[model samples]
Each structure stands twice: as structure tokens, then as C-alpha cells.
Target: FVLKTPKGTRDYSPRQMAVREKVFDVIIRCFKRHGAEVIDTPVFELKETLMGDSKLIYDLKDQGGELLSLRYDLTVPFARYLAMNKLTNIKRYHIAKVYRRDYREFYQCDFDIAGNFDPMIPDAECLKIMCEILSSLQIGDFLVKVNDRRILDQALEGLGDLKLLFEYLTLFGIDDKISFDLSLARGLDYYTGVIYEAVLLQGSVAAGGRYDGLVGMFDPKGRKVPCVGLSIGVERIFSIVEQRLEALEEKIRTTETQVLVASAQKKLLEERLKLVSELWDAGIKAELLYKKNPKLLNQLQYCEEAGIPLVAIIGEQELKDGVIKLRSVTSREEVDVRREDLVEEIKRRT
Candidate 1:
């Protein structure tokens, strides 16, 4: 059979991973800045997660006995954890791939607060974080459409609750970015308070809200833990990042490799290997070609194309002199350093 990644799934290349990692870094930094610690949960849960469309879920074949299915979202999983652990309060973040038949796999970065607290305290933080994250991405003008399920359930007969929420957003100075969208209804049934969706000009980019009743759905004793959280589906953000970079004609260096090892003379492959190994042992990132004797021109060209910053050139003359020539890939300048000081030299230049 011809090779395929299978339907609704993908394999991220090194280039794509470069963008993926940078996006993740920005999210992680923002999450940690606000005191949210990371937590991890299983990839699959029991089949009857009490449910999805049933057909949309990737139900695992009988695992020896019990029914199971891959996880579809980060919110429910966190809710289950709260009930299972009897945790009354926590501020946590989780990023994991959720599986579903459609879109198959996606990275869901979730930040949630669990506990009984002052009205709009944790809720406001979620909005603040959402704005902080989007602003940090420099992702252009965006708005967090706000409403409360207390009203959406034909309930906001409740205007003060929304005004209360916006008052917090105003103090946070993100009120300009907040819209009182009455029609911004979220689909989840568990939401008991304010609910929100972040929208860009393109459409909705994120969704989350308060679910004071969800934990009890998973708790056998019916005790509930109040929760307010948001899910940032980054695959959409990935497209925006990629598009912006492409429009700017920017280059993304997939690696931070420090130097490339090269031998100017044949029969010195072993010398190149030994030097590269030494660099590794000394905690330097280095790379080399596999050929017995690789050309200096090709070696330097590889550095140029790959964006490796420095080239460690080994030659018989340099060997006799007990030194190596370090050339800057971008600067077109070269310097000879004592072999013992090569590590420090690479460190210094890069």
C-alpha cells in the first residue's frame, strides 16, 4: 500500500514544528506569568463521555474489556479530574491533542480556575489572559464577545451580571476589546455563568466559559466544583502566524545548531568525527557530513543554506599548529583559535 498519514491526521515537519514550538512558547510564557501550572491527562477516556455526536468520536476498540474513546476536548477532561481528585480549587493549564473524527487532531491549550471565589475575579483573569495572549501574538485587532448563560437560557433577565463582568474588563483596560454580544451563544450545556468566544475578523478563534455544574456530571456523589476556563485552539492561530510570516517574506530557522564540523583534507574524517564528538561532550551543538572526506566549499555552502552560524574547519596545517579555523557563516570572516580553546571560541562567536 502507498504510504499515507491516514485521514484527519498529520505529521508535523521540522519546519512546521518550528512554528508550532514558537506558538507554544508564547502561550506557555503567558500561562506561567499568571501563576497557572501545567497538568496532563490521558489521551483517551471511557467511551460514554456522556457525549459527543457518537459518530464523531474515535471510540477505541474493546481494550481487553472496557469501552473507551480518545479525548475530544480539554474542558471535560479537566472537569473529570477535579471531581476524581476532590480538588476544590486550582489554577491549572493543559495542552494536549484532542481526537475527533472531524479535524481529527488539534492542540487544545486550556487554562482553568476551579474554586468558589469573588464574582468575576477568576472570570476576569480568563478574559485578561485571552487579551494578553492575543496581543502578545501581535495578531491584529480582536474582540472577546461576552454574554452570560444566566441570560442566554432566556435568563440574563440578568443585565447586572454582564455589567459586573465588563466592569472587571474595564479595570483591566481590555474593555475596548470586549463586545457585549447578546447573540454570542456557546453550545455546551453546563455553562451556568458568563460565557465567551474570541473572534478575529475571520470568525471565532476560541471558546470557553463558566461551568459550575459540569464537575458534578462526572462526580458520582453529585458534588460540584465551580470552574471558569477557555480553550485556545491553536491550529487556527498557526495559520495566522504562517500567513503573516509568508506575507512578510521571512525565514524561520528550524534549528539552533551552533556549528558544523568540516575537514579540508581527505583521510581526516576520523579527525572531524573526533572533534565533533568532543564538541558534543563539551555541550556544544554541532553537525557534520557523513562522507569520508567532504569538500570545504560544500561544507561552507551547507552552513549558508542551513543557517548554521559557525564552521569549525580542520586542516593538516591547523592540526600541526594545534589550532582550528572558525569561520562565521554570515560574516565571511575567519579566525584561528587554539584547539584547547575551540569550545570557548565557538561559544564566544555564537
Candidate 2:
């Protein structure tokens, strides 16, 4: 039998992990630099807490007679978190798994900024930040396809037939699902003003719109207040990133690892450590390919395919000589270097 993941879930192996971590590094840095700090929420909440406040929850309550549901998006919990904690003067960022009942095949990575609601400014600033983040990921030829739900609602009044709104959008190639009469409606009642969906020219990769009523849904005073936030489909964005990387082959340069230290015997582990320390001290991403009778040519072949330019070869003889043989996979040039010069030599070639 084939080992497998749950139907809609996935497993990340080494190569996948490498790409994901790299993406995360970029995403987190962008968030941090833009005055957004990290926060987290539970994977599940009371069904009443979620479904009462959201239409998108995967209502999965179990045996104890407790009403629990998996979160459908980040915005609701974040708003609730902000309000319940009485968190004032806040700017926070969250990256987490969110669930939905109807969408059996999808998952979400969502974020939002709330507190002081300014109709155009907050959403526009967030969208700008989103664009920069996507640009950093090198998603090519992207445009922020924004339409305020209210604007569409007002525009639909001109057609004198709100029922034809979807048809009108389709006539112009817009496929995003907006509700009837409420063709601009976000299905959920929580969405209020300046709703938007972001699309890439290639296709729709991520989407989110404004929601002002969400926070007030949980308010003890039942006093309605306004809020705005956005949701993004992380998996979908990643798919576009993968496709874009494939399209721009030159732009898809795999990161060049700095050093590979290969040793052919266990006795030289001590010697291998010294070389590794030198590489690391130079801030290089280094690996020790330890093996008995380590085939230098095979290792070099892997390095060349991976785009790593340099490999340091060590054996019993090289250890005694106090020199490491550096081979340049790029030029197929070989050189003997003293321990002190190893870092510089690798840097120059890399």
C-alpha cells in the first residue's frame, strides 16, 4: 500500500521544505519590516464562536457536547483576538492553517490589519504591501484587480438589473463570485466596504475583501462597529509562484550553496569539522557529505546540477598535508589551498 497524506493535506519532504522555508523567510521578513508583528490563534474554536460569527467555518464538533469548529479564515479570529484582548495600538501579522467546510479541497493562509478603520487608506496600504511581497517572490506581470463592493453595487444600479451583475462582470472576463441583487456581496454578511480581490494576469492567485461587521458580531454590547481585512489563498499563490518560476527559467536560479565538504573516512571526522567551521564562520551554507570511499566525481556532479560552484575534497592524505583541494565545478579548475585561504577561495569562486 502506498503511504499517503490525508485527502486534502500534504507532506513536505526535503526539497519541498527548502522552497517553503525560503518563501517563508521572504514573507516573514516583509511582514516584520512593514510594522506587522507575529501572533497565533487556535486551530479550532467553539462552533458557536465561529459559525455564530462566520458562514465559512468547518463545523466539526465532537463527543463532549462541546460546540467546536475549525476556523475558516484568519480575519474573524484576528478581529476577535484584537477586541477580546483589548489590544490597542496594535499591528500584528499571522500565518496559520485555516479550514472551511464546503471547500473540501482547499486551505488558506490569511492576514489582516484592523483597529482604526479608514475606508481607502488601510486597505490600499495593505494591498500595496501585498504587491511588494508578491514582487519579492518574483510573481511576474501582476496587477492589483481591485473593485470596491459598494462601487459595484452603485454601478449595478446603472444597469437597472442587479441580477445581471455577474453576467456583466463575465462579459468583461471577471469570474469572481459576487452575490445576487447583492452581486458584490461577500456571501458572508460580515463584509462591509471597499471589498477587493487581487489577481495576477496569469490567473487569480489570491483574494480578500473588506469586512466591517465581523468584529461587532462578537461584541457583548451588540453595538455595531466597522472593521476591514483581507484573506489570501496561500496554496494558490504558491502555485502561481511555481508556474512563474518555470516560465522565467533564468529568473529561477536555484540558490548557490557555498561549500560542500566531503570526507572519505570516519577517522577524518575531526578534520572535516575544522573545514566546516571555516565555511560556517564565513557565513556560508555548508554541508558535510560524510561517507567511506566518497566518490568525488559523483559528489561534484550533484553540485554542478545544483548550481553550487565549489566543493572541498578531503581524504587521509589531504588531512596530513594541512591543505584542502578545491575544485571549481564551473571551470573544472583545481587548486591546493592552505586552511587560512579556504574561505576566501570558496568566496571568490562562489
Candidate 3:
């Protein structure tokens, strides 16, 4: 039998992690800009707290015999948190790992405005936030398709209000990205008002809706909290960006390492340390080998593999001359610079 990770679980290399960081950065920035405070809840909740199909939950038996289940979505947990805390008003965001009985777990980034807010105010803001995130990523051209659930309500009373909301969407300059479809009813029963889904050329990347009644379901007093929010399918976004970058033959440096210090001769580890410390003090990203006397070839190879653009070589001759040989990894060009001027030279090149 082969030793391997369990099905639906895998590892991310440094390159993938780099890309993932950039993705989260763009998402978190947009969420905070809208004055959303971050919050978190447990990964698993009481069995009855979960929403959606029961079969989808990955239930677990507690050591003390309490029944628990992995959360299939983030919104329900947020609702539970709000009700348990008796909180009725808050603008919050949550980024966490969510699980189901599916083949794999997905990282969810959710931004929600929960309170007694005016109609279409939070709803319109959700759409605007989605536009900002998608634009910041620059993954590709995308569209935010919108539809109001009230259009499908038997009363059909929200049409005029929705028309006015669309007018506001036009005023926000994202009207081109917004569209109305009378048939676009979301699958979730919780959504009671305007709902939207963002579609890249690849497929659906994000979606959410106004769930004004969910919090009330958990509240003992039946106090309704008018909440609107969206969740970004970050895994899907990462896959799309990874494939797009691959097609473009773009290389993503796994590390921010700018330089590697090398010793040309034995017994110079201390000198190497000194130079590295200086660079660090200058706010440069630099490193040296851990080995007592690493070979020059090995040191240079490490630099090339790590995508480090520069290498500073120090030897008895260079040390005596009070200079260091700085080499460019890409062009293999070597030049001597005064040791005192090394920090300025590196800052300029980087």
C-alpha cells in the first residue's frame, strides 16, 4: 500500500501559499474598507444548529458522548452566534475553513451586515463589495448577476423598489455588471430579498443573498434581524488564478527573499553572519547557509532555486579589500562594491 494523504486532503507548496496570500489580502482589504469587523465561530456546532440537508453534515461523536457536526456553511454559525449572544446589530466578516460530507473542505470568506437595516441598503452594498473584490483581483472580466426574490413572491410587491435599487446600482457605476432576472431564485430557503451571484468566464466564483428571517428563527422572541451578506468561493478563485497564471507562463516567487550571503572560503561563517546581520538591519530580505562551510556552488544554486535575485560573496580577498562581490543570479554578472555601500546598492537593485 502506498503512503499518502487521505482523499480530499492535500498540501500546498510555497508557490501556492504565495498566491493564496495575495488572494486573501485582496478579499480582506475590501471587507475592512467597508467597516466590517472580523469574527470567528467554532468549526463544529451542536447537531441541531446546522442548516441545509442533514446528509451533508459530517457528524462526529464527542468523547463525552455529545453529538456535534461540521458546519456546512458559515452563515448559519454566524446566525447562531448572534442569537446566542443576543446581538441584533453588527457588521462582521469571517474567513475560516468550512466542512461538509463532500470530497473536500473549502475556505470560506464571508462578509455580512446583520441588524435592522433599511431595505436594499445592505443589499446594494453587498453588490458593491463584490464588484470591488473582483476588480482588485484582476483575475478576468466578470459580471455580478442580480435578482430579487420578491419578484417571485406571490405578492409581487417589490418590483418598484427593486427598480429603484437598480437605479442606485446605476448611480454606483456598477450598473453594467448588475443585471436582473426574474427567474433567478437562489436554492437556499433563507434568502428573502435581493440575491446575486458573480460569474467569471470560468464559472460562478461568489454568491449570497439577504436572509432577513434566519436570525429570527433562532431568536426566542422572534426578533428579526435584517442581514445581507456574500460568501466568496476562494478555492474556485484560486484555481482560476492558478490556471490563468500557468497559461501566461508567469512565475510566482515562493518567497520574498531578496539576497543570499555566501562565504568563498572556510572559516568565514562569522563574517557571513556579520554581513547578513547588516543587511537585515537595513530591512533587506537576506539569508545564509546553516552549514559551517557551504560550497560556493551549493550556495549559488540555493539562491537560484529560491528565486533570490542577488548574492553577496565574501572571501579573504574581498574581506581584506573591504568590499563584497555582488552577483546577479539571472545575468550571472559580478561586481565589487564597498562593504559600507552594500545596503544602499541592494535597496536600489531590489
Candidate 4:
């Protein structure tokens, strides 16, 4: 018999995780730099949230007539939260997973602003930061724009509507980057104002727009709030970014481990544990071999493989000498660090 992993449950190994994190860090810091707050909700939302907001969702087993389903996207869940809490205005970012079949979803990093605001100011910021994010990623060889009923133009029915958005884009000094196309008919039923999508290396594009009526679906009296936001296609970014970083042939470290606690001679088991404990309390990330006084060669080999920067060694002689022998993994040099100074010693070394 043979064992196999489940469908779409492919493992993300340590190196891949490191690469994924780099992508997330870039997206997250850009969100914070703008005036966005962070929030998260359940992985599976009420099934009705998807019916009105998404399609082809992954449904779960029924619990005696109470239908449950995986979230298709964060926008609907964020709308559900606003209607329930009766919030008039808030700017927030949501980073979570949404499961969907048929090429619909991934790690949905959503940023939205909801309330009554004057004339595209909120939406302006939304598109503004969208360019900021794309620019920060250095993947924007080009940008695009297609207008509808927002802006006033020479020859179009929905020209006024798109004019408003492009007008805002122009103010942000991105007019040269945008190529106004007339063929972009964004697919969504709830967008009362305007809608936009991101384009990528092939087909994947970031998504956002103004959906003033989406909030009204979850409301009792059919009242709604003005909302505009964007969702970052994280899986796409990871697919695009890992190629750039790993292609450089760098030793990408998965763990931020500062030191490995090691001992030279036998019967210093208790000594190794004691030193590691202090290092932990001192807020130093460390690790030790979990054997009965393992060989020093194995310890050094593990550190080298893990790319650990330093090692703290304690043997019989070092213990008697009241010193912790600190070795630099890179320099191959050892220093006699006094017991009281070990914590401070490691802190400075790192």
C-alpha cells in the first residue's frame, strides 16, 4: 500500500513558508502605512453570505438543516460584520483564507472603508494604495483603466463615472501608468458606482471597487453604507515572487534561531537545560539537541545546517571556570562569556 496527501492539501515546506512570508510582509506593511486597521473572522461564514456575494462555493456537511459553507471571500463577511454591529464608518484590513473551487479564491487580504464619505475620497485612497502596493512590489510594467458612468468624457454614456475614478488616479500622479481601455466590463451585480480589477503576468489581477448596496443585503430595513475596497491575490503574488527570490540562489532561512545550546563533555545535561532556560527568559531564540549529552560534532553540524548565527557551549571545564563559551558560527571564534554576562552577551552578539 502507498500513502498519499489529500487533494489541494499540498504541504508548504519551511523554505516556501519563508518565501510566502516575505510576500505577506510586503503586503501587510503597505496596508499599515496607509490608514488601515486589522481584523479577522471565521473561516466558514453563514452560507447565505456567499449566495448573494459569490458563486460555486465549497459547502460543508449539513448539521440538521443548518447549512454551512466555506467563505468565498472576505468582502461579504466584512459586510456581515458591519450590518450586525451597525457601524457607520470604519477603515479596516482583513487577511484570511477563503475556500472556493473553479479558480475563485486564495489567501484573501482585504482592505475596505465603509461609510458615507464625500465624492470618491475613500475610493480615491483605495485605488491610490492599490497603485502603491503594485509599485512597491516592482511588478508594474504597465497599468490600465477603463471607464464607465463616473466621469465626464468626450464621447461615452458612463463617462462621468469613470472620469471620477481616473480623475482621482491622475491626482495621485499615476495618469501616465494607466491606459484607459473601453472594453473592461467588470462582472459584479452589487457595484452601484464603479468596479476595477488587477492584471498580472498573465491573467490574475487584484480586485476592488465601490459596492454601495452590498451592505444593504444583510440589513433588516434594506439600508446600506458606502463601501470601497480591494483584495490582494496572495497566492498569485507568492507564485510570482518566489520565482524572483529563489532564482538568486540565496540561503533563505526558515527559522530566526539565534543560537544553539551545546555541550562538549558528558554529564552536563542539566547544565545545557539551565543555560537554554535563561536564554529563553532573556528573549533569545535558541535550540538544543534533546539527547543525553550528544556529541559536539553533531551539534555544530545541526547549527551549520540550520544557519544559526551563534552557539553557546558549556562543558565541565567551562562550568568550573564560571564562563559560557560563545562561538560565532560564521567566524569560528570562541569568547569566554561570564555567567552573568551571557544574556547580555548573546543580546549584543545577535
Candidate 5:
């Protein structure tokens, strides 16, 4: 009998791992390129804090008769941390598994900015930075759907009617449901001021907004710090990208030879394996084709369908002759250089 993994969580096979890692590369690349600092928090927080904004969290009590709960979202956790730790003028990037309720939802990633109350200035900056993040990730053709609670509120100021405001937002397809209301207080009770929903335009990829002054209402001095953030729904992005493009599909294919060292003998394979180890040590992706097949045509064919972009082939002729072959998998082109030049050659291509 075989024991299988649990539901909701993920277990990636080798090929799947490669693709996931590639996707993460794009994510981290985008984060670093933008000017956001990193911050993390525990999944469980005091139940009082988690439930402070009732509309947002999944709450429960611990064995010790202490109230505790899973973080409903990253931004709220940031707020609780800031108010508790007394952090000010904060900018953070959080990528973590945020637990919600009984059913595990999806992997969530978020970027947020917090500071004293101002107008839509931070909102605009966050939007700009988000655009930059998406651009850096090369996730092209996206849109940031923005709406302000205050803007919506101000529109209703004359009417002074929450019912009418709900009606207006619902009529415009902004409400959660046709039967629901959008009193600019649609989400966690904490939300106030300007808010943003990161829309793929292609789809609703993720959502976030400002919660200015929510923390203060729960704090010692009742001092609320202004805050804003965005959350990425990984599942949503997967669906949207899957629907529109083949890039993600292309990423999942298993490649044959990650590193092909043309060797005609055991010692040469060992030598090339040593080089492969060094490449791995440097945090570079490298592999050896264990089967020592001498046919170049077969090796190149293996590289072709597998999408191995670069190959390093070292042969007896090249070794005794003092050279190795470097081929561009994409272009089906090659160049020969001395053994001493191999590492440097690979470095140049990379």
C-alpha cells in the first residue's frame, strides 16, 4: 500500500519542481526589482487581534483557553504587527502561506505600504510599483483596477445613504454579489480610505486596499496609522495565465540533458561531473546525462525537445586535442574552445 500526500498542500515531482522554481524566479525577480522590503509574521495571532476586523478573519480558541486564529490575509497581520511593535512609515513584501479557515484556500503573495494618513499619494505609488513589479516579471498586458472608499463615500456624501451607495456599486458590478451592498465598507471592517483591486483585466487576479486608521481604533492611544496593500491569488493567476498564454505550458515540459559533457571515457565523465558539481555549487542549474551515449545526433535531439538551451560537450578528441564543444540549443549552433576556457565560456553564455 502507498501513503499519499494530503489535500490542499502541494507535492511537486521533479519536472513540476523545475517549473514551479522557474515561476518563483519570475516572482522574486519582480519583488527585488521593486523597492519593497521583506517582512513575515506568524500564521496564528491572538484571536482578539484576528477577529478585531470581524469581516476578514477566521477565528478560534487554543487549548489553553486563549483565543487564537489563522491569519486571514497578510496585510491585516502587518497591521497588527505594526500597531503592536510600534512600527511607522513601513514598506514590506510578504510571500507566505496565509491560513484562513477550515478549508485551506490558496497560496497568497502580497506587497504593501503603510504610513500616516495622507490622500491617494501612497495608493498611486503602490500602483506604480505594482505595475513595475508585473512588468519586471514579464507578465504582460495587465491592468490595475482602483477604487477609493472615500471617493465612493464622497459620491454618497450628498445622499448620506449607505443603501444608495450599495446600490450604486452593485449596479456598476463592484459589489460582491447582486444581492449585496458596497457601503465602501465591503471588506474587513478595517478597510477605509482608498482601496485597490489588482485586476488582470483578463481576470480578477487579486485584491487589496487601504485600511487607514483601523489599527488606531484598537490601539492604546487610538492612533491609527495609514496602510495599504495588495494580495496575489496564486490560483487566480494560474487560471488567467493558463487561459491566455502557452508560456506556462511550455515551462512544464521535461528536458533531456541539462548538461551534456561529450565524453568517450569514464575519467572524462568524472571530470565533467566535477564541473557539473561546481556549477550546482554556484546556485546554477546543471545536470549530467548518466547514460554515456557517444552519438552527437542523439544527444542534440535529446536537448531539442527538452528545451535545454545550452550544452557543454567534452570529447576525447576535444580533451586530447585540448577543447570542448559549446552549443546553443535554441540556435543549433556550436563553438569549440580549450578545456581551460570551458567554465569561462559557460559563464559568458549565461
Candidate 6:
């Protein structure tokens, strides 16, 4: 028998996780630079929160007559959070997992500004933030296809709304990354004003728009809190980056080990552990073989295979002489260094 993750879901190994972390770092930096505060919502939201998109939601059973479901997206749960807390204005970002019936799970990075601000102030900033983020990623050339719902309504009525939107987009210096697509209708019903979708070489990789009425839906008197935001398709970005790395024959180092302490002979394991502890205390990522008595060849092989930059080999000779032999994994260069200078030398070399 074989065990496997359910279809549409896959585990991320250390290499993939390293890449994922870097992607998150770039995104979070851009959000923080814009003064967006981070917030979180539960993985499972009250089913009412996902009311409009009931078909795609993965529903859960109820104790009474009430129903519950996995969060369809971060945006809806965020809307519920804002209305329930009576928040009039806030700049918040949320990075969390969401689930749907068609697929088990996915990640969404949502950055939104909720308040009654002047028209297009936050909306334009949203586009600018998109430019900064996509430019930071090595995902190849892309464009932000945008259309105003107000303009779309006019275009449907046989007016020249596309040209007007094009002229407006040009004013922000982002016309190069935008196109006035009349047919680019987003699936959500909550969007009330301008909507933008980011298209990459793979396809639409990010999308969002102003949905001023969504927050009102949760309110008793239907008081609206204007909102505009973006949700990055994290899984799609991961796939693109993974493909790029494979095409370039690049490998992501999973571990941050700067040095591996190894023993040249049996019974020297204690000495290796001591050296490892010292390196760790000095803020170095160092490790030693878990085996009681591993061979010199095996230790070096481990370092090379794991992409450890340097290996510190200690044996009887070095223990007696109060020094250690440092071997560079890539260059295979060996140098003897006094024990007192081992940490500093490893730091300098790296």
C-alpha cells in the first residue's frame, strides 16, 4: 500500500521551503514599506462569511442548524473581521491558508486598506505596490490589466470607456504595465469599483480591486467601509520560481550550516561536539555527525552532499596541538587554525 497527499495538494520539501521563504520575504518587505500592519484570520470561517460563493466552499457539518466551512479566501474573513470589530479605517496585511471544495488548500497574501478615503488615492497606491512587488520577483515580464467597473458598465452600454481608463492609467506612470481590457471580468460579485489583475508569463498571478460594499454586507444597517486590496497567487508564484530554477540548473541550499564538525577517528566524537557547541555559542550554524564513530570519508561526503561550506575536522593531532583543520568543501583546500581563532576564521571565510 502507498500513502500520498490528496490530489491538488503537495508537500513542500526543504529546498522548496527555502524558495518559499525568500518569496515571502520580498512580499512582506514591500507591504511593510507601505505601512501596512499584519493581521490574521481563522482557517475556518463562519459559513455565512462565505455566503456569495457557496458552491466553491468546502462545507462542514453543524451542531445545531448552523453551518461552518473552511475559509474560501482571506478577503471575506477580513471583511467579517472589520465589520464585527466596527473598524472604520485600517491598513492591514494577512498571509494565511485558505481552502475550497475543488482544491484542498492554498495560500493567499492579502494586503488591504479599509476606510473612507478620497477616490483612487489607495487604489493608485495598490497598483504602485504591485509594480514594486512584481519587479522584485524574477518572474519575467508582466502587465497589470485593469478596468473600472464604472467604465465596464458604460462600455457594456456602448460607450468608449476603455480609452478613458487607458488615459487615467497613463497618468500614474504605470500605463506600461496596464491594459484596458473590457472583457477582464473578475468572478467575485463584491467588487464595486476599479478592478486590476496581474498577468505573468504563466497566467494571471495576482488580482484584487476596490470592494466598498463587502464590508457593508456584514453590517446590521449596511454601512459601507471602502476597501481595496490585492491577493498574490502564492502557489502559482512557487511553480514559476521552481521552473525557473530547474531551467537555470540552480539549487537552493536547504540548510544554513556554515561549518560541520567531524572527528577523524573513533572516541573523538566528544571533542567534535565541544567544537560544535562553541561554534553555536558564537552565533554560527554548525553541526556534527550523530553517529558514534563515523569514518573521515563519510564525514566529508556528508558535508559535500549537504552543501555545507566548510568542515572543521578534529583528531588526536589537533586535540593535542590545540588547533583544528578547516577544509573547504567546494575548493577542497585545507588549513590548520588555532582553536581560539576557529569561529572568527569561519565567519570571515563565509
CA lDDT of each candidate?
Answer: 0.84, 0.63, 0.85, 0.77, 0.62, 0.82
Model 1 ranges with Cα > 4 A deviation? 154-158
Model 3 CA deviation exceeding 4 Å by range: none
Q: What is candidate 5's lDDT per residue for 146-219, written digit by digit as tens?
A: 44565554575323333334444544343442122244244545567555555443244556777776556556
Best by TM-score: 3
TM-score ranking from best candidate downward: 3, 1, 6, 4, 2, 5
TM-score of each: 0.93, 0.77, 0.93, 0.87, 0.71, 0.92
1 or 2, greater by lDDT: 1
Q: What does the lDDT come to for candidate 3?
A: 0.85
User: Per-residue error at 315 for model 4, in Å?
Assistant: 2.8
Stretches of candidate 5 exceeding 4 Å from the true structure: 1-5, 12-34, 53-68, 134-145, 150-185, 242-258, 265-268, 274-285, 290-302, 327-335
Model 2, span 1-350: residue lDDT tens: 78876566666565555556667677778777777767788987777666554465567646778877777767777767867876533566677776664424354555566666433455555566666567677666455454455545456432432233334455434334332233433444555555555556544455565666777666777655455455555666666666655676633435557677875455666677777887887897887665645666777877877767778888677767878888777887888888778877777765
Better of 1 and 6 by lDDT: 1
Residue pairs clashing in model 2 are: 47-67, 179-182, 179-183, 212-227
**Residue pairs with backbone overlap in model 1:** 151-156
User: Model 5 — TM-score against the truth?
Assistant: 0.71
The TM-score of candidate 4 is 0.87
Per-residue lDDT of 92 in model 5: 80
Superposed model 2: Cα runs more than 4 Å off: 53-65, 102-107, 117-119, 149-188, 247-257, 263-270, 277-283, 305-307, 315-321
Candidate 2 yields a Cα-based lDDT of: 0.63
- Model 6 regions lying over 4 Å from their true place: 63-66, 154-173
Q: What local lDDT does model 4 show for residue 20?
A: 81
* Cα misplacement distance, residue 81 of candidate 4 (Å): 2.1
Lowest summed lDDT across 10 adjacent residues in model 3 is found at 152-161
